[PDB]
Scaffold this active site. Structure first.
Site, mmCIF file in Angstrom:
data_model
loop_
_atom_site.group_PDB
_atom_site.id
_atom_site.type_symbol
_atom_site.label_atom_id
_atom_site.label_comp_id
_atom_site.label_asym_id
_atom_site.label_seq_id
_atom_site.Cartn_x
_atom_site.Cartn_y
_atom_site.Cartn_z
ATOM 1 N N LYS A 1 30.100 -1.823 12.368
ATOM 2 C CA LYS A 1 30.516 -2.582 11.100
ATOM 3 C C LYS A 1 30.202 -1.428 10.089
ATOM 4 C CE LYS A 1 32.702 -6.090 12.532
ATOM 5 N NZ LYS A 1 34.127 -6.369 12.360
ATOM 6 N N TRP B 1 44.083 -11.013 22.040
ATOM 7 C CA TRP B 1 44.268 -10.812 23.526
ATOM 8 C C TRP B 1 44.059 -12.249 24.243
ATOM 9 C CZ3 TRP B 1 39.039 -8.161 25.641
ATOM 10 C CH2 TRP B 1 37.734 -8.898 24.964
ATOM 11 N N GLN C 1 21.221 -7.897 15.462
ATOM 12 C CA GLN C 1 22.462 -7.219 16.014
ATOM 13 C C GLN C 1 22.819 -6.074 15.584
ATOM 14 O OE1 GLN C 1 24.475 -10.781 13.168
ATOM 15 N NE2 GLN C 1 25.893 -10.326 14.917
ATOM 16 N N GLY D 1 40.588 -18.317 13.678
ATOM 17 C CA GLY D 1 39.372 -17.915 12.881
ATOM 18 C C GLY D 1 39.999 -17.077 11.255
ATOM 19 N N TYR E 1 26.274 -4.412 16.474
ATOM 20 C CA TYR E 1 27.210 -5.069 15.799
ATOM 21 C C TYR E 1 27.088 -4.230 14.411
ATOM 22 C CZ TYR E 1 29.966 -8.738 13.229
ATOM 23 O OH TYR E 1 30.999 -9.377 12.506
ATOM 24 N N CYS E 2 26.141 -4.126 13.816
ATOM 25 C CA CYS E 2 25.757 -3.542 12.514
ATOM 26 C C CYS E 2 26.090 -1.987 12.586
ATOM 27 C CB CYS E 2 24.181 -3.442 12.413
ATOM 28 S SG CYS E 2 23.622 -3.018 10.737
ATOM 29 N N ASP F 1 45.080 -6.247 24.283
ATOM 30 C CA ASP F 1 43.808 -6.102 24.078
ATOM 31 C C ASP F 1 43.782 -4.592 23.159
ATOM 32 O OD1 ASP F 1 41.257 -4.732 24.293
ATOM 33 O OD2 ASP F 1 41.089 -4.966 26.409
ATOM 34 N N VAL F 2 43.186 -4.823 21.954
ATOM 35 C CA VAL F 2 43.137 -3.683 21.060
ATOM 36 C C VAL F 2 42.322 -2.311 21.547
ATOM 37 C CG1 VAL F 2 43.951 -5.193 18.987
ATOM 38 C CG2 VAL F 2 41.345 -4.471 19.552
HETATM 39 N N1 NAD Z 1 32.816 -15.121 10.967
HETATM 40 C C1 NAD Z 1 31.700 -14.463 10.686
HETATM 41 O O1 NAD Z 1 30.758 -14.719 10.144
HETATM 42 C C2 NAD Z 1 32.128 -12.771 10.405
HETATM 43 C C3 NAD Z 1 31.323 -12.386 8.975
HETATM 44 C C4 NAD Z 1 31.935 -11.031 9.058
HETATM 45 C C5 NAD Z 1 32.681 -10.154 9.592
HETATM 46 N N2 NAD Z 1 33.472 -10.942 10.609
HETATM 47 C C6 NAD Z 1 34.628 -10.156 11.547
HETATM 48 O O2 NAD Z 1 35.977 -10.992 11.303
HETATM 49 C C7 NAD Z 1 36.842 -10.637 12.197
HETATM 50 C C8 NAD Z 1 37.324 -12.035 12.595
HETATM 51 O O3 NAD Z 1 36.468 -12.648 13.509
HETATM 52 P P1 NAD Z 1 36.284 -14.228 13.459
HETATM 53 O O4 NAD Z 1 35.083 -14.665 12.659
HETATM 54 O O5 NAD Z 1 37.722 -14.584 12.974
HETATM 55 O O6 NAD Z 1 36.054 -14.650 14.987
HETATM 56 P P2 NAD Z 1 36.758 -15.213 16.118
HETATM 57 O O7 NAD Z 1 36.187 -14.943 17.321
HETATM 58 O O8 NAD Z 1 37.320 -16.424 15.669
HETATM 59 O O9 NAD Z 1 38.289 -14.429 15.879
HETATM 60 C C9 NAD Z 1 38.408 -13.065 16.450
HETATM 61 C C10 NAD Z 1 39.618 -12.956 17.320
HETATM 62 O O10 NAD Z 1 39.767 -11.731 17.754
HETATM 63 C C11 NAD Z 1 40.547 -11.588 19.006
HETATM 64 N N3 NAD Z 1 39.793 -10.484 19.772
HETATM 65 C C12 NAD Z 1 38.644 -10.138 20.220
HETATM 66 N N4 NAD Z 1 38.666 -9.094 20.955
HETATM 67 C C13 NAD Z 1 39.677 -8.732 20.962
HETATM 68 C C14 NAD Z 1 40.689 -7.500 21.572
HETATM 69 N N5 NAD Z 1 39.887 -6.421 22.403
HETATM 70 N N6 NAD Z 1 41.939 -7.274 21.592
HETATM 71 C C15 NAD Z 1 42.711 -8.256 21.026
HETATM 72 N N7 NAD Z 1 41.950 -9.344 20.184
HETATM 73 C C16 NAD Z 1 40.725 -9.583 20.298
HETATM 74 C C17 NAD Z 1 39.821 -12.841 19.432
HETATM 75 O O11 NAD Z 1 40.468 -13.348 20.672
HETATM 76 C C18 NAD Z 1 39.740 -13.968 18.601
HETATM 77 O O12 NAD Z 1 41.277 -14.697 18.285
HETATM 78 C C19 NAD Z 1 35.822 -9.691 13.354
HETATM 79 O O13 NAD Z 1 36.067 -8.394 12.839
HETATM 80 C C20 NAD Z 1 34.547 -10.021 12.850
HETATM 81 O O14 NAD Z 1 33.386 -9.083 13.246
HETATM 82 C C21 NAD Z 1 33.192 -12.287 10.891
HETATM 83 C C1 SWL Z 2 27.574 -13.779 15.288
HETATM 84 C C2 SWL Z 2 27.319 -13.119 13.904
HETATM 85 C C3 SWL Z 2 28.474 -12.843 12.946
HETATM 86 C C4 SWL Z 2 28.207 -13.020 11.465
HETATM 87 S S1 SWL Z 2 28.007 -11.162 11.020
HETATM 88 O O1 SWL Z 2 29.187 -10.652 10.560
HETATM 89 C C5 SWL Z 2 26.805 -11.389 9.449
HETATM 90 S S2 SWL Z 2 27.741 -11.962 7.966
HETATM 91 C C6 SWL Z 2 26.164 -12.061 7.037
HETATM 92 N N1 SWL Z 2 26.189 -12.254 5.799
HETATM 93 C C7 SWL Z 2 24.860 -12.186 5.164
HETATM 94 C C8 SWL Z 2 25.011 -12.681 3.851
HETATM 95 N N2 SWL Z 2 24.001 -11.929 2.792
HETATM 96 C C9 SWL Z 2 24.202 -12.520 1.755
HETATM 97 C C10 SWL Z 2 25.440 -13.323 1.760
HETATM 98 S S3 SWL Z 2 25.883 -13.807 3.375
HETATM 99 C C11 SWL Z 2 23.600 -11.852 5.785
HETATM 100 C C12 SWL Z 2 23.631 -11.470 7.372
HETATM 101 C C13 SWL Z 2 22.312 -11.035 7.905
HETATM 102 C C14 SWL Z 2 21.905 -11.755 8.798
HETATM 103 N N3 SWL Z 2 20.677 -11.305 9.107
HETATM 104 C C15 SWL Z 2 20.415 -10.384 8.160
HETATM 105 C C16 SWL Z 2 19.263 -9.634 8.037
HETATM 106 N N4 SWL Z 2 21.606 -10.312 7.434
HETATM 107 C C17 SWL Z 2 21.723 -9.409 6.173
HETATM 108 C C18 SWL Z 2 25.063 -11.456 7.929
HETATM 109 C C19 SWL Z 2 25.345 -11.334 9.321
HETATM 110 N N5 SWL Z 2 24.880 -10.860 10.287
#
Ligand code: NAD
Ligand code: SWL
Length: 259
Positions: free
Chosen positions: A155, A37, A148, A16, A151-152, A64-65
């Protein structure tokens, strides 16, 4: 020269966004410790990078962080192996509203633990050369998500923590800058977790509202997020910055009305 020859530690690096960061940093001349992990994903990732870039430029550590002893041991290993730490990316995270306590431990507690370990090694007040720490938040760190809430919460906590730790660094003259990135939706495994009751618990029935937001705004590919990371590292005026990355408005910093 802001990246070239530097040592980066990236958590969640097996796939990712984490992997994308590792590739971008390797292309800019960094040495990268990949920390994850998932041992099998990790080995696959390093083996692939070893084909593209030099094997000695990467190290894979399974960790595992959320385990503070494993995290401390990981840091020690990275610094032993590469001899210094310059760039820390706290990127590992999960989506799980059912076991939401664990989600807080991974997403929030581990970012703080990692940050403070980074400061232990990198702060000029502790014998270090300074550095940069980048914490991964989310647009969910700035805006609410009905499906979520925890999660919210996690973050949002990253945002408050990172802005605060950045001001503390200036005060402590540590020479470490701390910034966060807040991406919109990105095309990774994590997007698939919304389909799963095991992850969504009581929110599963409302998963389609997320899908409609995905449809509404669109999805970035990991490599576009990495450009954003490189900007943060290259610009040393940037401390306490909250960088948003969306398809709709691009790369933009959050504005705040501070006193
Ligand atoms: N993909 C999205 O839409 C999105 C949006 C905003 C933020 N993020 C953030 O981006 C970051 C990376 O996520 P991604 O989307 O690449 O997802 P992903 O699941 O593909 O990658 C996450 C990685 O973190 C590792 N990981 C998870 N828990 C762990 C732990 N306890 N110790 C060590 N490693 C661990 C997983 O094994 C995996 O390789 C995360 O913080 C996620 O919340 C993702
Ligand atoms: C499994 C979910 C992982 C993705 S989350 O980090 C994430 S990224 C994200 N991005 C957006 C964007 N808004 C404008 C441009 S992109 C929105 C959300 C989201 C989802 N549902 C709501 C109400 N919001 C605000 C979210 C949201 N929930």
């Amino acid at each position: 020269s802001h990246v070239n020859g530097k040592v980066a530690l990236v958590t969640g690096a097996a796939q990712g966004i984490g992997r994308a960061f590792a590739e971008a940093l390797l292309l800019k001349g960094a040495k990268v410790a990949l920390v994850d992990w998932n041992l099998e994903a990790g080995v696959q990732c390093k083996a692939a990078l070893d084909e593209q870039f030099e094997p000695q430029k990467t190290l894979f550590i399974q960790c595992d962080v959320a385990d503070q002893q494993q995290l401390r041991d990981t840091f020690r290993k990275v610094v032993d192996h590469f001899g210094r730490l310059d760039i820390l990316v706290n990127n590992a995270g999960v989506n799980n509203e059912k076991n939401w306590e664990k989600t807080l431990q991974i997403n929030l507690v581990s970012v703080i633990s990692g940050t403070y370990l980074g400061l232990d090694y990198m702060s000029k007040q502790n014998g270090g050369e300074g550095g940069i720490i980048i914490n991964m938040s989310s647009l969910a760190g700035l805006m609410p998500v009905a499906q979520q809430p925890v999660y919210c919460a996690s973050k949002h906590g990253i945002v408050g923590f990172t802005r605060s730790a950045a001001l503390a660094a200036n005060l402590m003259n540590s020479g470490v800058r701390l910034n966060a990135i807040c991406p919109g939706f990105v095309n990774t495994a994590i997007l698939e977790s919304i389909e799963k009751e095991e992850n969504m618990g009581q929110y599963i029935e409302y998963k389609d509202h997320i899908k409609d937001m995905i449809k509404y705004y669109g999805i970035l590919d990991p490599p576009l997020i990495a450009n954003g990371l490189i900007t943060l590292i290259e610009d040393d005026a940037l401390n306490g910055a909250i960088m948003k990355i969306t398809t709709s408005k691009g790369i933009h910093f959050q504005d705040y009305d501070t006193t």
